[PDB]
Design a protein around this nucleic acid. Structure first.
Length: 316
DNA sequence: CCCGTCC
DNA sequence: TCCTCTGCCTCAAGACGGG
DNA sequence: TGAGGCAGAGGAT
């Protein structure tokens, strides 16, 4: 994401953040970065220091998390579409390349979660590149109400609305924090292109940031000079030298014109979970408790009925 | 609440 | 002297409930 | 990985 962007918005554009009761979201569609969720589950869902697993050692922490987080959302009337990352851009790979077993999401984790989601009737999409960019595209085209993510990248990708820390709001019984991009730009007095340059200065996954430039300086410089190139000419090279081989022009273009899925091609449905196949998969292969799975499918089934009744005469 | 299980 | 940033550290990132 | 709480070294004023 963007280093410190969340903190900055709260401190400088407080009106861009609204708190709404969770009831008021009943019926709404949200886009979710599924690769980011799998990673959180692999890291946090542990016992004795190891992931949950079946007898033969296959990882199940990610299925555990995806199954119950998704059902909890549906019970609050929030309808998720999961976006899976595609091949990362060159800059992301290059920046990672420049930078206790280390957790990593594999194609196998993705495929297993895709298989679970299909048996649950939960829609998912494959982004051609960055999932957050495609999430932004779904919000922009009106296919979902918001991206539900902790990665402020979506904002840099133009997502008009972002639901921040949704699952912690659910677990702790707190209102949901909604970020409104337009309000951000209005409070900072910036346009989207200037915001992207600011985000790069704060620190992005695509490229390096100027050493000695942090949140306070970057806001002031972007407001007066309006672009990174105009800033670098005015900056004193002895005091604040830029990093060599700086790829900010390239990172700017990635944020402005990301490869994204076509949102008009997207068909979205939340269909009846397949209880018998879920049992064979989660219990027969993954050794989840059958009593717990059945209970989760029943809650998900009942969730669909309430969503359908609430939305039948109120299409979105 | 505290902290262990889930697989 | 004050403001701003950087390093270093530490922690928690899930969902849920039994006791 | 990031994000909050502190330490302190600079340039900022």
């Amino acid at each position: 994401g963007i280093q410190g962007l969340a903190k900055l918005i709260a401190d400088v554009a407080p009106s861009a953040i609204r708190e709404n009761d969770i009831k008021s979201y009943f019926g709404r569609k949200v886009a979710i970065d599924a690769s980011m969720s799998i990673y959180q589950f692999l890291i946090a869902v542990r016992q004795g220091g190891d992931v949950l697993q079946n007898e033969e050692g296959e990882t199940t922490s990610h299925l555990m998390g995806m199954f119950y987080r998704t059902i909890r959302m549906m019970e609050n009337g929030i309808k998720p579409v999961y976006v899976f990352d595609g091949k990362p851009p060159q800059l992301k790979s290059g920046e990672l390349a420049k930078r206790k077993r280390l957790v990593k999401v594999t194609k196998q984790h993705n495929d297993e979660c895709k298989h679970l989601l299909s048996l649950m009737g939960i829609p998912y999409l494959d982004a051609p590149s960055e999932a957050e960019a495609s999430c932004a595209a779904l919000v922009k085209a009106g296919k979902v109400y918001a991206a539900a993510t902790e990665d402020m990248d979506c904002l840099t990708f133009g997502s008009p609305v972002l639901m921040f820390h949704l699952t912690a709001s659910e677990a702790k019984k707190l209102p949901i924090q909604e970020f409104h991009l337009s309000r951000i730009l209005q409070e900072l007095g910036l346009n989207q292109e200037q915001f992207v340059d600011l985000c790069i200065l704060l620190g992005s996954d695509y490229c390096e940031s100027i050493r000695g430039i942090g949140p306070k300086r970057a806001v002031d410089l972007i407001q007066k000079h309006k672009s990174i190139e105009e800033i670098v000419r005015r900056l004193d090279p002895n005091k604040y030298p830029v990093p060599e081989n700086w790829l900010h022009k390239e990172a700017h273009q990635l944020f402005l014109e990301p490869e994204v899925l076509d949102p008009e091609s997207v068909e979205l449905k939340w269909s009846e979970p397949n209880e018998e196949e879920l049992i064979k998969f989660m219990c027969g292969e993954k050794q989840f408790s059958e009593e717990r799975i059945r209970s989760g499918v029943k809650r998900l089934s009942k969730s669909r009925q309430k969503l359908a009744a609430a939305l039948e005469h109120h299409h979105h």
